[PDB]
Ligand binder design. Structure first.
Ligand SMILES: *[C@@H]1O[C@H](CO)[C@@H](O[C@@H]2O[C@H](CO)[C@@H](O[C@@H]3O[C@H](CO[C@H]4O[C@H](CO)[C@@H](O)[C@H](O)[C@@H]4O)[C@@H](O)[C@H](O[C@H]4O[C@H](CO)[C@@H](O)[C@H](O)[C@@H]4O)[C@@H]3O)[C@H](O)[C@H]2NC(C)=O)[C@H](O)[C@H]1NC(C)=O
Ligand SMILES: *[C@@H]1O[C@H](CO)[C@@H](O[C@@H]2O[C@H](CO)[C@@H](O[C@@H]3O[C@H](CO[C@H]4O[C@H](CO)[C@@H](O)[C@H](O)[C@@H]4O)[C@@H](O)[C@H](O[C@H]4O[C@H](CO)[C@@H](O)[C@H](O)[C@@H]4O)[C@@H]3O)[C@H](O)[C@H]2NC(C)=O)[C@H](O)[C@H]1NC(C)=O
Ligand SMILES: *[C@@H]1O[C@H](CO)[C@@H](O[C@@H]2O[C@H](CO)[C@@H](O[C@@H]3O[C@H](CO[C@H]4O[C@H](CO)[C@@H](O)[C@H](O)[C@@H]4O)[C@@H](O)[C@H](O[C@H]4O[C@H](CO)[C@@H](O)[C@H](O)[C@@H]4O)[C@@H]3O)[C@H](O)[C@H]2NC(C)=O)[C@H](O)[C@H]1NC(C)=O
Ligand SMILES: *[C@@H]1O[C@H](CO)[C@@H](O[C@@H]2O[C@H](CO)[C@@H](O[C@@H]3O[C@H](CO[C@H]4O[C@H](CO)[C@@H](O)[C@H](O[C@H]5O[C@H](CO)[C@@H](O)[C@H](O)[C@@H]5O)[C@@H]4O)[C@@H](O)[C@H](O)[C@@H]3O)[C@H](O)[C@H]2NC(C)=O)[C@H](O)[C@H]1NC(C)=O
Ligand SMILES: *[C@@H]1O[C@H](CO)[C@@H](O[C@@H]2O[C@H](CO)[C@@H](O[C@@H]3O[C@H](CO)[C@@H](O)[C@H](O)[C@@H]3O)[C@H](O)[C@H]2NC(C)=O)[C@H](O)[C@H]1NC(C)=O
Ligand SMILES: *[C@@H]1O[C@H](CO)[C@@H](O[C@@H]2O[C@H](CO)[C@@H](O)[C@H](O)[C@H]2NC(C)=O)[C@H](O)[C@H]1NC(C)=O
Ligand code: QSM
Ligand code: QSM
Ligand code: NAG
Ligand code: NAG
Ligand code: NAG
Ligand code: NAG
Ligand code: NAG
Ligand code: NAG
Ligand code: NAG
Ligand code: NAG
Ligand code: NAG
Ligand code: NAG
Ligand code: NAG
Ligand code: NAG
Ligand code: NAG
Ligand code: NAG
Lengths: 738, 735
C-alpha cells in the first residue's frame, strides 16, 4: 500500500497530509509528484535522490519560509515542470535544471530577477513571476537582457509587480505577454517592436479605476489615464486577445487596431468610455471580433434615461458575446439596440447591474440568433395594462447554468423588482426555454395564466421568492416543463394562515427534476400525498418531515407513493428522528439514489431494503445511528454505494463486508469505531475510515493483515486515520504501526 | 429568599419548579409562578397566605390539575392568571372576590354558570384561544355573563362562536370578538351596550396574509354581513376594529350615532373603491387614527393613488396609515385633501412599491412630524395573544430619532447612490433613515446640502465610501450617526479607508461603526473628535490594528477628549498592548471589551481612568484576576466578567473596592471561594459555575448569611458540580 501519497504515466497525490519533510517512501516509477499545502521547510539534494523518472514536482504553499540548497533539483534530468508558489523565497533558487520547460514563482518575496537563476534555463516555454514585489516594494529589479537568452519562451507573466516601465530585450518567440497592475504609466513603440508572434497582450490595471478588488488599488495622480503611443501595437499582426481593463481610458485611438485583422477578444471594462460607446471610430476597425466587454464604464453620479450605442456597432460582424454591464441607465428602447440586431453570430447579451427600470422586450425577438439574455441585478417591475490564476476583470463562469441554457433561449430576470407576475410581463418575448426569476421577492398566487406568452419553458428557476401555488392549475400552462426549482420559498409553507397544496405536479407530463429545498413544509391540505408519472428526481431537503410522519391519523404515510418513475430522492436536513416502517415501505421501489443525511436518525430498519431492488446509492451521513445489520445480503443485492460518515457506529457486525457482493464504495469515516474484528472482514474498491477513535494495540492486528491481503480496496487519506489510545501510539497512522 | 426573589412582589419565574414552594413569606402580596414545571394545585399550596392579591400560574408545565376550591381560602385574591395550562374546563370553586380572570391558550370547550356566574365582582374576563382549530363550536350558556354586572372588559376572541353571545351586561366598556367566525351581525347583538367605547369585530370572513394563527376565508371570498342599525346605540364608541373582514363597501349609517370615534381600523379589506369615493369619511369629524393598510386589488399596479375629496372632513386626524395600496407614482394633486388638516403629523406609505414621489407635496402640510416611505422603490434623483395582530403598535421611527424633529424614512428603497436632486424641495428634516438601500456613494459633502439640519442620521446596512475629509460635514448640526453593517468597503483588501470627517463635527455625540470590519485605517491613522461622548466600534478588527509592526494605531482613541462610552466588543482581540490601552480616553465612564478572545488584562492601567464606573469583559478567555484592585481603581461600580476562564478569586478582592456595587462572575470555572477573598456591593452573580459542594464551600455559605443585603440573582442556576450525590441541588440548599 502506498503511503503517504496516493498512486494513480503514474501520478502520486501527496497534497495536504501534514508532512513536515519530503517522504522517502515514494516509488521510483512515479512521474508526477504533488507536495502542495504541506508543512515542509527544507529542500535538499537527498529529498529527490534516485528519482530520474520524475517530470513534474509541485511544492506550492510550503509551509502552511522554504529553504532550498544550491543545486537541489540539479540531479533530476527529466524535470520539465516545477511549481514553487507561496514559499516566501527571498530570491530565485541557484542551480535549477536546464531541462525545465515550465517554472512558476508566484506569491514569493523575490525582489531581484538575476541572470544567475533564469538565463541559464534556455528550454523554458512558460515563466510565471507574479505577486513578488507587490506592496512591500519599491521597484522590481530586472536585469538587462535577462529574458533575451530564453529563445524558446512562449509565455511570460510579470503581472502584479512594481515595474513602472516595460522590460527591455524581449524574445521574438513570445505568444502571450501578461503585464497587469505593473504600474506602467507610459507605453512606447519600442516596447512591443520585436514581438511579431504575440497573440495575447494584457495591459490591464495600469492607472486603474478602483472597484471590488482583492488586491490593493492605487489610482494615477489627478485622475490620469494610460499613455499608449499611436504606433505601440504597429507590428502586433497575430494578436487575438487584448486586455485594456482598468486603464482609466477616456478615448480609444483607432490607429491601435489598424494592424489587427485577427482580434477575437477585446476587454475594455472599468474605464471612462461612455463617449466612445456613443461615438467610436475603433468599432469600424474590428471586423473579426467575437467577444467585446465594455462593462462598468458609467459616469459617476450620472443616471441617463437611455443607453447611447454607436451606429458603428453594426461593423462587428463576427460578434458572438457582448458585455454591457455597469453602464447605469433607466430605460432600454428598441431604437437603442438597432445596430446590434444586424449581427448574425450575436448569441449573448449581458445587461447585468445597469439598474434598468423599463425594457421594451419587443426588441429581443427582433434578433438573428439570441441564446442568452442576462438582465439580472436590474430594476424591472411588474408589467400591467483568492487565486492568482484567474481573470480579475472578466467572470469566466457562465452567466446562466449550462443545464438551463442546454434547452434553448435563456432569459435571466433574477434579482429584479418583479414582486408579482403581471399580465403583460412576457408580452412580445422570443421562444424562451430557460427562465430565471430568482430573488425577486415574488409573492404571486399562481393560477396558470402568468406564463402563457412563453409556454415552452423547460427549465424554470423560481428560487429565493415568496410564491403561492395552492391552485391545481398553477404552472400547468408550461406543458413542456422538465426542471422546476422552487428552493427558498419558505414564507408560504411556514405561515399557518394558508392551506399548502401540491396537486399541480400531477398535470405535468414531462417534469423530470423538482427542487423543494428549504421551504419548511409541515402541513398539506387537501392533498396529503404528491404524485407524478414523469418525475425522476426530487429534492425535499431543508423541510419538516419529522412533523409529517408524526401525524396521529397517519395521513402523510404514502407521501411519495405516487412518484412511480422516481430514481433520485433527497430527504436531508429534515430533522428526522425516526422513520416509520409503513412510511418507508410507501417510498418508490424504482429508486436508485436516496439521501437521508444531516438528520437526527437514531435507528434504521435495513429489512425494508428488500422492497427496493433498483437502489444503488444510500446516504445516511451526519446522523445519530448507533448500530448496523448482520444480514444485509438477505435484504439488498443491488446496493453499490453506502455513506455512513459522522455517525455513532461503534461496532461493525460479523460478516458485513463478506455479504453484500454488489457493494463497491463504503463510507464509515468520523464514527465511534475502535476495532475491526476478523469475523466482520468481494467487489469493494473504496473504503473510508478516517477520523475514527481507533484502539492501536494487538486487537487492531487482524484488520491490518486484511489491508495487506486486499490491496485493490483503496483507502483514501490514510494520514487522517489517527490512533486514539494508547498515548505513545496517539498521532501516528494505523498503517505506520510495527 | 429562595427560590423566589423578593422585591412587595416575589418573582418566581423560570426556576424549574416541579411544585409550589412553601418557603414563600406571608408578607408577599404578588406571586408570579410563570414558566415552571408545576402540575398540581391544591388547597395546601397557598395555605396561610391571606395577604396575596395576585397569583400568576401561566405556562404550567412549560396539563395542570386544580382541585375544587383550591383558591377559595384566599380572601384578598383579586387577579388570577391561568394561561397555557391545557385545562379541560373552568376550575370549580373560584373566589368571588376576583376582579380579573384570564383563561387564554387552554382547552376549555364549555363556559358554564358553575364556574364564572358565581363571580360577580369581575371587571376583566379573558376567554381567548380556547376552542380554536381542535371541538367544533364553543358552548356558551344562556345568560352566563348576565350575572356579571360589574364587567367592563370581555374577550371571547379566537373561539369558534359563529354567533354573537346573547344577554350581555350594560356595564361593558370594551368588547373583543376577533376571529370568532361570526359571519352575520344583527341589531339585537349590541342593543343594550350603551357604555361601549371599543368594539373589535376583526378577523370575521378574513383576507389571509402573513399570520401566525390559522386563516380560513368565507365561502367564495364572502364579506361580513353587518346590519345598518347594528351600531345604532353605540354613542360612546371611540375605537372600532374592522380589520380582515373582506369589506368591499362601508355603510355610512354605521357612523351616524358615532360622534366620539377616535380610532378606526379598516386594514386587510377590499376598500380601494371606498378610498376613491367614500361617504363614510364625512361622518368622521373627531377621528384621530385611520388605518386603510393592505386594501390593494390583486394583480393591480395603478399609476397613482385615488384619494377621495371627503378626506378633508377628517379635521381631528393625527395619523394616517396607507400601507399596501400598491401604486407606481405619488403626485402633489393626489394628497390635496390631506394638506388642509392641522393635526396630521404621521403619514405611513410603507410597502406601496412607489417608483417616484413628488417630494414637493410634503412641505404643503401644516404639521408633518413623521414621513414613513420605507419598503418602496424610490431610485436616485438626477408569539403573544396580548398584542395587536393587524396594527404595528411599535413606533414607525425610533423615538431617539423622532425627538430631534421632522423624521423622513427612505429605508429599504432603490437609492443605490445619493443623487444631486435626491432631497430637492424637502421640509426641514432632523431625522433621516437611508437603511438597507445598498448605497455605494463616495460621500464628498454635497449629498445632504438640501437638508443640512439632520441631527440623527441612519446609514445602516449599505456599501458607502467616506474617505473624503469633507464627507457628511455639510451636516454641521449632526449629533447621532449610525454607520452599522457597512463592511463591504473596509472588508475589500486594499483601497484607502479614512475617517478624517469626524473631527469636523462641532456637536456629534453618538457614533456607531459596528460590523464594518475596520483593519487598515490609512492615513490619518487615529480617530479624533472634541464633542463625541459615545462610540460603538464593535464587530471590527482591532486585533490587526494593534498588531502593527510600527505602532501607528497606538493612539487610535486619544483624540476623543469628551468620550464617556466605548464599545470594543467582538473585535477578535487576543491581547491589548499597554501603550494602546494608556492612550484610551481618561474621561471614559463605560467600557465594553466583551465577546473577544482576551487571555490577559493589565489592571494596573486602570489608575489613569478616575471616571470609569462600568467595565465589561464578558465572554473572554481571561484566566486570573488582580489582588490589589483598590490601588488602581476607586470609581468602578459595575464589573462584568461572565463566561470567562476564571478559576480562583484572589485574597482580599471583595474587601478592597468601596465604590463597587455590581459584580458579575457567572458561567466561569470557579470551584471554591476562600474566606480571605471574602463593602457597598448590592448585586453578585455566580450562576452556572462548577462549584465543589463539600466542606471548603462552608466559608462562602456563612458569608451569604452574614451579608444579606448583597442580593444574588437566580440561585437555582448555581448548581454543584461535585460530588455526584450533591449534583443538581443549589449551594444555599446544602445542610
Ligand atoms: C486579461 O484578459 C486575458 C484574456 O484576454 C486573461 O487571460 C486568461 O487568464 C486566465 C487566468 O490566468 C487563463 O486561464 C488559465 O489557463 C490555464 C491553461 O489553460 C490551458 O488548458 C485548458 C484546459 O481546458 C485549455 O482550454 C487552454 O486552451 C489552455 O491550453 C488553466 O490551467 C487554468 O485553470 C486553473 O483553474 C482550474 C479551475 O477553473 C483548475 O482546474 C486548474 O488546475 C488551474 O488552476 C486557467 O483556466 C487564460 O488561459 C488566459 N487567457 C488566454 C487566452 O491566455 C487575463 O487573465 C486578463 N487579466 C486580468 C488581470 O484579468
Ligand atoms: C435544486 O436541485 C437540483 C437537482 O438536485 C439542483 O441542480 C443540480 O445541481 C447539481 C450541482 O449541485 C448539478 O450537478 C453537477 O453537474 C455538473 C455539470 O454536468 C456535467 O457532467 C455530467 C456528467 O454526467 C454531464 O452529463 C453533463 O452534460 C455535464 O457536462 C458536474 O460537473 C458536477 O460534477 C461535480 O460534482 C460531482 C458531485 O456532485 C462530482 O462527482 C464531480 O466529480 C464534479 O466535481 C455535478 O454533477 C446538476 O446537474 C443539477 N441538475 C439540474 C437538473 O440542473 C439545483 O442546484 C438545486 N437548487 C438549489 C438552489 O440548490
Ligand atoms: C383591534 O383594535 C383594537 C384597538 O382599537 C386593539 O385593542 C388593543 O389591544 C391591545 C392588545 O390586547 C391592548 O394592549 C394591551 O393593554 C393592556 C392593558 O393596558 C392598560 O395598562 C397599561 C399599564 O402600563 C396602560 O399603559 C394602558 O393605558 C392600559 O390602561 C396591557 O396589559 C398590555 O401590555 C402587556 O403586553 C405588552 C407586550 O405586548 C408588554 O410590553 C406589557 O408590559 C404588558 O405585559 C397591552 O398593552 C390595547 O390596550 C387595546 N386597545 C384598547 C384601546 O383597548 C385590538 O387588539 C385589535 N384586534 C386585533 C386582533 O388586532
Ligand atoms: C449603534 O449604536 C447606538 C448607540 O449605542 C445604538 O443606539 C442605542 O440603542 C439602545 C438600544 O440598543 C438605546 O437604548 C435604549 O433606550 C430606550 C429608551 O430610553 C429612553 O426611555 C426610557 C423609558 O423607560 C428612559 O428610562 C430613558 O431615560 C434614562 O436614560 C438613562 C438610562 O440608563 C438614564 O441614565 C437616564 O437618567 C434616564 O433615566 C430614555 O429616555 C430604553 O428603553 C432601553 O432600555 C435602552 O436603554 C439607545 O437609546 C440608542 N441610542 C441612540 C442615540 O439612539 C444603535 O441601536 C446601534 N445601531 C445598530 C444598528 O445596532
Ligand atoms: C431605519 O430603518 C430600518 C429598516 O426599516 C430599521 O430597522 C429595523 O428596526 C427594527 C427595530 O429595531 C427591527 O426589528 C427587530 O426585529 C427583531 C427580530 O424579529 C426583534 O427581535 C426586535 O425586537 C425588533 O423588533 C427590524 O428588524 C429592522 N429592520 C431591518 C431591515 O434592519 C431601523 O430601526 C430604522 N432606524 C431608525 C432610527 O428609525
Ligand atoms: C438564477 O439566478 C441566480 C441569481 O443570479 C443564480 O444564483 C447564483 O448562483 C451562483 C452559482 O451557483 C452563486 O455563486 C450565487 O451566490 C447565486 N446568487 C444568488 C443571489 O443566489 C442562479 O444560479 C441562477 N440559476 C440559473 C439556472 O441560471
Ligand atoms: C456617485 O455615482 C455613483 C455611485 C455609486 C454607484 C453604484 N451604487 C451601487 C450600489 C450597488 C451596486 C451592486 C448591485 C448588486 N451587485 C453588486 C453591485 C452597484 C452600485 C453602483 C455602480 C457600480 C453601478 C453608481 C454611481 O453612479 C452611477
Ligand atoms: C396577484 O397580485 C399580487 C400578488 C402579490 C403582491 C405582493 N407581492 C409582494 C412582494 C413582497 C412584499 C413584501 C415587501 C417587504 N415587506 C413584506 C411584504 C409584498 C408583496 C405584495 C403585496 C402584499 C403588497 C401584490 C399583488 O398585486 C398588487
Ligand atoms: C537554510 O538556509 C540557511 C541560510 O543561511 C543555511 O545556512 C542552511 O544550511 C539551510 N539549510 C538547512 C537544512 O538548515
Ligand atoms: C514593423 O517594424 C519595422 C522595424 O521597426 C518597421 O519598419 C515597420 O514599419 C513596422 N510595421 C508597421 C506596420 O508599422
Ligand atoms: C463611425 O466611425 C467613423 C470613423 O471615421 C466616424 O467618423 C463616425 O463618426 C462614427 N460614427 C458615429 C455614429 O459616431
Ligand atoms: C423589428 O424592427 C423593425 C424596425 O427595424 C420594426 O419596424 C418592427 O416593428 C420590429 N418588430 C417586428 C416584430 O418586426
Ligand atoms: C385557480 O385558477 C383558476 C384559473 O387557472 C381560477 O379560475 C381560480 O379562481 C383559481 N383558484 C383560486 C382559489 O384562486
Ligand atoms: C415512466 O414510467 C413508464 C412505465 O411504463 C415508462 O414507460 C416511461 O418511459 C417513464 N417515463 C420517464 C420520463 O421516465
Ligand atoms: C422493520 O419493519 C418491519 C415491518 O415492515 C417490522 O416487522 C420489523 O420488526 C422492523 N425491524 C426493526 C428492527 O425495527
Ligand atoms: C387530579 O388530581 C386529583 C387529586 O385528587 C386526582 O384524583 C386526579 O386523578 C388527577 N388527575 C389526573 C389526570 O392525574
Ligand atoms: C386636533 O384638532 C381639533 C380640531 O377640532 C383641535 O381642537 C385640537 O386642538 C387638535 N389637537 C391638538 C393636540 O392640537
Ligand atoms: C403647495 O405649495 C406650493 C409652494 O411651495 C404652492 O405653489 C402650491 O400652490 C401649493 N399647493 C396647494 C394645493 O396648496
Ligand atoms: C472630496 O470632496 C471634495 C468636495 O468636498 C471634492 O472636490 C474632491 O474631489 C473629493 N475627493 C475625491 C478624492 O473624490
Ligand atoms: C471641516 O471644518 C472646517 C472648519 O469648521 C470647515 O472648512 C468645514 O466645516 C469642514 N471642511 C469642509 C471642506 O467641509
Ligand atoms: C467637551 O469638552 C469640553 C471641555 O472643556 C466641555 O467644555 C464641553 O462642554 C464638552 N462638550 C460636550 C458636548 O460634552
Ligand atoms: C502593565 O503595564 C505596565 C506598563 O504600563 C507594565 O510595566 C506592567 O508590567 C504591566 N503588567 C502586566 C501584568 O502586564
Amino acid at each position: 500500500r502506498s503511503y503517504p501519497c496516493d498512486e494513480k504515466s503514474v501520478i502520486a497525490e501527496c497534497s495536504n497530509r501534514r508532512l513536515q519533510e519530503v517522504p522517502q517512501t515514494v516509488g521510483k516509477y512515479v512521474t508526477e509528484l504533488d507536495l502542495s499545502d504541506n508543512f515542509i521547510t527544507h529542500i535538499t539534494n537527498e529529498s529527490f535522490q534516485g528519482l530520474q523518472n520524475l517530470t513534474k514536482i509541485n511544492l506550492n504553499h510550503n509551509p502552511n519560509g522554504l529553504n532550498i540548497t544550491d543545486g537541489a533539483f540539479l540531479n533530476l534530468k527529466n524535470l520539465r515542470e516545477l511549481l514553487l508558489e507561496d514559499n516566501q523565497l527571498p530570491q530565485i533558487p541557484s542551480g535549477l535544471p536546464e531541462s525545465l520547460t515550465e517554472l512558476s514563482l508566484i506569491q514569493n518575496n523575490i525582489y531581484n530577477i538575476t541572470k544567475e537563476g533564469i538565463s541559464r534555463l534556455i528550454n523554458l516555454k512558460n515563466l510565471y513571476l507574479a505577486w513578488n514585489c507587490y506592496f512591500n516594494c519599491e521597484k522590481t529589479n530586472i536585469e538587462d537582457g535577462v529574458f533575451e537568452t530564453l529563445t524558446n519562451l512562449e509565455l511570460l507573466s510579470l503581472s502584479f509587480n512594481s515595474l513602472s516601465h516595460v522590460p527591455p530585450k524581449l524574445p521574438s518567440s513570445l505568444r502571450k505577454l501578461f503585464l497587469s497592475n505593473t504600474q506602467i504609466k507610459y507605453i512606447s513603440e519600442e516596447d512591443f517592436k520585436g514581438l511579431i508572434n504575440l497573440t495575447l497582450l494584457d495591459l490591464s490595471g495600469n492607472c486603474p479605476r478602483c472597484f471590488n478588488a482583492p488586491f490593493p488599488c492605487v489610482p494615477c495622480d489627478g485622475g490620469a489615464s494610460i499613455n499608449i503611443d499611436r504606433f505601440a501595437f504597429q507590428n502586433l499582426t497575430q494578436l487575438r486577445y487584448l486586455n485594456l481593463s482598468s486603464t482609466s481610458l477616456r478615448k480609444i485611438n483607432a490607429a491601435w487596431f489598424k494592424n489587427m485583422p485577427h482580434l477575437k477578444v477585446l476587454d475594455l471594462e472599468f474605464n471612462y468610455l461612455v463617449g466612445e460607446i456613443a461615438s467610436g471610430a475603433f468599432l469600424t476597425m474590428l471586423p473579426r471580433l467575437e467577444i467585446l466587454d465594455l462593462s462598468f464604464n458609467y459616469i459617476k453620479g450620472s443616471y441617463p434615461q437611455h443607453i447611447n450605442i454607436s451606429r458603428n456597432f453594426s461593423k462587428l460582424l463576427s460578434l458572438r458575446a457582448l458585455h454591457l454591464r455597469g453602464y447605469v441607465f433607466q430605460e432600454l428602447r428598441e431604437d437603442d439596440f438597432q445596430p446590434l440586431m444586424q449581427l448574425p453570430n450575436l448569441s449573448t447579451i449581458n445587461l447585468g447591474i445597469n439598474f434598468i427600470k423599463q425594457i421594451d422586450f419587443k426588441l429581443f425577438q427582433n434578433f438573428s440568433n439570441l441564446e442568452i439574455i442576462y438582465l439580472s441585478e436590474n430594476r424591472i417591475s411588474p408589467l400591467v395594462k483568492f487565486d492568482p490564476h484567474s481573470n480579475f476583470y472578466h467572470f469566466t463562469r457562465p452567466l446562466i447554468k449550462p443545464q438551463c441554457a442546454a434547452y434553448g433561449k435563456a432569459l435571466d430576470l433574477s434579482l429584479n423588482s418583479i414582486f408579482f407576475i403581471g399580465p403583460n410581463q412576457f408580452e412580445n418575448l422570443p421562444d424562451i426555454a430557460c427562465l430565471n426569476l430568482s430573488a425577486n421577492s415574488n409573492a404571486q398566487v399562481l393560477s396558470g395564466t402568468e406564463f402563457s406568452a412563453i409556454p415552452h419553458v423547460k427549465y424554470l428557476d423560481l428560487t429565493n421568492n415568496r410564491l403561492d401555488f395552492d391552485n391545481a392549475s398553477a404552472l400547468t400552462e408550461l406543458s413542456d416543463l422538465e426542471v422546476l426549482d422552487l428552493s427558498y420559498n419558505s414564507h408560504y409553507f411556514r405561515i399557518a394562515g394558508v392551506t399548502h397544496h401540491l396537486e399541480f405536479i400531477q398535470n405535468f407530463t414531462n417534469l423530470k427534476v423538482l427542487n423543494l429545498s428549504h421551504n419548511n413544509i409541515y402541513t398539506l391540505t387537501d392533498k396529503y400525498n404528491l404524485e407524478s408519472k414523469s418525475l425522476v428526481e426530487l429534492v425535499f431537503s431543508g423541510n419538516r418531515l419529522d412533523i409529517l410522519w408524526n401525524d396521529d391519523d397517519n395521513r402523510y404515510i404514502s407521501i411519495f407513493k405516487g412518484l412511480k418513475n422516481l430514481t433520485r430522492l433527497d430527504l436531508s436536513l429534515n430533522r428526522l428522528k425516526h422513520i416509520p416502517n409503513e412510511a418507508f415501505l410507501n417510498l418508490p421501489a424504482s429508486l436508485t439514489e436516496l439521501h437521508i443525511n444531516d438528520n437526527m436518525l437514531k435507528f434504521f430498519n435495513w429489512t425494508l431494503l428488500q422492497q427496493f431492488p433498483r437502489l444503488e446509492l444510500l446516504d445516511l451521513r451526519g446522523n445519530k445511528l448507533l448500530f448496523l445489520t448482520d444480514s444485509l445480503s438477505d435484504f439488498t443485492s443491488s446496493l453499490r454505494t453506502l455513506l455512513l460518515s459522522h455517525n455513532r457506529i461503534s461496532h461493525l457486525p460479523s460478516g458485513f463486508l463478506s455479504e453484500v457482493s454488489s457493494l463497491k464504495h463504503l463510507d464509515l469515516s468520523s464514527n465511534l469505531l475502535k476495532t475491526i474484528n476478523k469475523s466482520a472482514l468481494t467487489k469493494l474498491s473504496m473504503l473510508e475510515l478516517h477520523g475514527n477513535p481507533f484502539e492501536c494495540t494487538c486487537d487492531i492486528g487482524d484488520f491490518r493483515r486484511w489491508m495487506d491481503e486486499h490491496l485493490n480496496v483503496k483507502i483514501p487519506r490514510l494520514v487522517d486515520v489517527i490512533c486514539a489510545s494508547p498515548g505513545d501510539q496517539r498521532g501516528k497512522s494505523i498503517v505506520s504501526l510495527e
